[PDB]
């Protein structure tokens, strides 16, 4: 279950090792799509499983006529969705620029169906995506604990935590707006909000433990490009009224260079700038000395991220902890013969004779809801909530 250096460990030594790692100069976290299923999300397998069931007429065309998806992975449910969306967008643009009317109407339906399927699963609260104070509910209990623990473990004079993610939902912002913390995401302004890459070099100071950083590597639901050649961000209640209510309850797709999720429209030099900046900032972080990183919920199916992670182990002062539930299946399938690229990639780094690599597996001991309890609380941290008992009395006064 717990492997360090090729050999096994017990629970207590692993917990002590985790505690020792949080006290270094730089601490970072990378989260995948597996960390949102506890609040209403879905995994990439389920999205394809539902799309294949709901739309069987369009499935044959993608395999036979246009050669965008093969048959073996379609039957096994191991397809990549964002690459498919990018390729479809490129196909549509090329078809539009040469005036081929027959092909132009063929891809609009495909893109509309794919966007409907991916957007319906990104909304974590259904029709309540408009209202306020969504982070007060019980589904976001661990997202608050993660941030609180990861902030409270820093001594004065040290840096602020960094949070990488591959999701495009609004869980972390909702969790942070309730505790009372501010997140830097690269944007500024209210009446016209724009993207400035230099906003990541700033920090707060008191003139008489406030901030954290958030990097999104695949965009977000509230980002879009208008006629002007600048990217804008709005609130959830405004996106719902502007362009989200039509995607779900209507067959609407008429703008091809509008949305910035997921990883689409990379052929435009104004949109790829954001993705490039995010990836470059991710790359520059793990090249610093005295760094520790945690990975949870991320299936190792990306070539570039895997290449970036492996190359950073050449430095003596880089450490990492990886969570992967289905480990025994991969070990048996690679020992017996066969397996996909993810299993080979995880196994080859499991067997290395390095003390900088640690892998934790299990059935439910490697989930997101168990990763938080491995992180400790300070001795003097307040826990007893005795402030809402007074707010209720104030409200009762009327």
């Amino acid at each position: 279950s717990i492997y360090q250096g090729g050999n096994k460990l017990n629970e207590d030594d692993f917990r002590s090792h985790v505690y020792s790692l949080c006290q270094l100069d730089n601490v970072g976290v990378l989260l995948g799509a597996g960390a949102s299923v506890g609040c209403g999300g879905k995994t990439m397998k389920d999205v394809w499983k539902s799309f294949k069931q709901n739309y069987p007429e369009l499935l044959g065309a993608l395999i036979d006529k246009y050669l965008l998806v093969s048959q073996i992975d379609s039957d096994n449910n191991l397809v990549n969705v964002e690459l498919l969306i990018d390729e479809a967008t490129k196909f549509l643009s090329v078809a539009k620029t040469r005036r081929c009317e027959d092909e132009e109407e063929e891809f609009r339906k495909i893109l509309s169906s794919l966007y409907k399927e991916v957007t319906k699963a990104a909304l974590l609260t259904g029709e309540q995506f408009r209202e306020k104070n969504q982070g007060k509910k019980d589904a976001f209990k661990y997202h608050k604990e993660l941030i609180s623990k990861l902030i409270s473990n820093r001594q004065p004079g040290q840096s602020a935590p960094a949070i990488f993610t591959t999701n495009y939902d609004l869980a972390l912002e909702w969790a942070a707006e309730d505790l009372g913390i501010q997140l830097f995401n690269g944007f500024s302004g209210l009446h016209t909000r724009q993207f400035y890459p230099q906003n990541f070099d700033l920090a707060f100071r008191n003139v008489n433990h406030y901030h954290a950083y958030l990097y999104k590597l695949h965009g977000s639901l509230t980002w879009y490009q208008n006629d002007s050649l600048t990217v804008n961000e709005v609130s959830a209640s405004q996106a719902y009224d502007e362009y989200i209510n039509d995607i779900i309850n209507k067959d609407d797709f008429y703008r091809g260079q509008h949305l910035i999720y997921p990883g689409a429209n990379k052929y435009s030099h104004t949109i790829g700038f954001v993705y490039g900046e995010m990836f470059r900032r991710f790359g520059e972080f793990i090249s610093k000395p005295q760094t520790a990183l945690f990975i949870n919920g991320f299936g190792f199916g990306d070539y570039h991220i895997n290449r970036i992670i492996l190359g950073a182990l050449l430095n003596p002062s880089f450490h990492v902890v990886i969570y992967y539930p289905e480990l025994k299946e991969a070990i048996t399938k690679v020992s017996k013969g066969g397996g996909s690229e993810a299993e080979k990639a995880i196994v080859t780094l499991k067997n290395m004779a390095f003390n900088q690599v640690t892998v934790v597996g299990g059935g439910s001991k490697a989930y997101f809801n168990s990763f938080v309890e491995h992180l400790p609380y300070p001795v003097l941290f307040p826990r007893d909530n005795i402030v809402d008992e007074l707010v209720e009395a104030i409200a009762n006064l009327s």
């Binding site: 790692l21 006290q23 270094l24 001594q155 004079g157 040290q158 000395p289 005295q290 003596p316 002062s317």
Partner: protein
């Protein structure tokens, strides 16, 4: 493509005042922990051991003071010997009359160099018994030669209720299972 050292630095020497050494630390280090290939180490609290790279030998020192002087930080240490490589292994010598030069780097001590310091000659391994572990870090095991313990007289001292009888029982039992043709009364 040249890698002279596989370890990271902590500070550098800025002065010598006889047999005491002064070190200023780098700007980034705040959390008292330094990481290397084998793991994490603590390098700031008094009573710890650090090292310097002086040519083809390694000097060993013990931390005594730590104070301010963004403000800077300073360390005072004292040398207790050096580590040498002879044929294919290492040996520890206990002469402390050698000091490093200005600009030399200060590095932490891993668990492999800590083994060499608290170790005996290899040819006496079959004639050795195990007592315990290091108190501060609890990683290294301690051995001693039977022929050098029970050759002259040995003394055990302590207060009541602290572990004299346990040590006596352990030491007497371990010898009989090793040299069955021995007399004990």
């Amino acid at each position: 493509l040249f890698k002279l050292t596989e370890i990271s630095a902590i500070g550098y020497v800025v002065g010598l005042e006889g047999e005491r050494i002064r070190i200023n630390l780098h700007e980034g280090l705040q959390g008292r922990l330094a990481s290397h290939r084998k793991g994490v180490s603590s390098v700031t609290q008094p009573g710890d051991l650090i090292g310097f790279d002086a040519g083809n030998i390694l000097v060993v020192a013990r931390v005594t003071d730590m104070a301010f002087v963004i403000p800077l930080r300073q360390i005072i240490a004292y040398a207790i010997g050096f580590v040498k490589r002879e044929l294919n292994g290492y040996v520890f010598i206990s002469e402390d009359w050698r000091l490093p030069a200005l600009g030399s780097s200060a590095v932490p001590l891993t668990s492999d160099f800590l083994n060499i310091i608290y170790s005996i000659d290899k040819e006496e391994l079959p004639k050795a018994v195990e007592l315990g572990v290091d108190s501060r870090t609890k990683t290294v095991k301690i051995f001693a030669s039977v022929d050098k313990l029970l050759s002259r007289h040995l003394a055990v001292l302590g207060s009541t209720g602290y572990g004299k009888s346990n040590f006596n029982a352990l030491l007497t039992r371990k010898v009989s299972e090793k040299y069955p043709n021995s007399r004990i009364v």
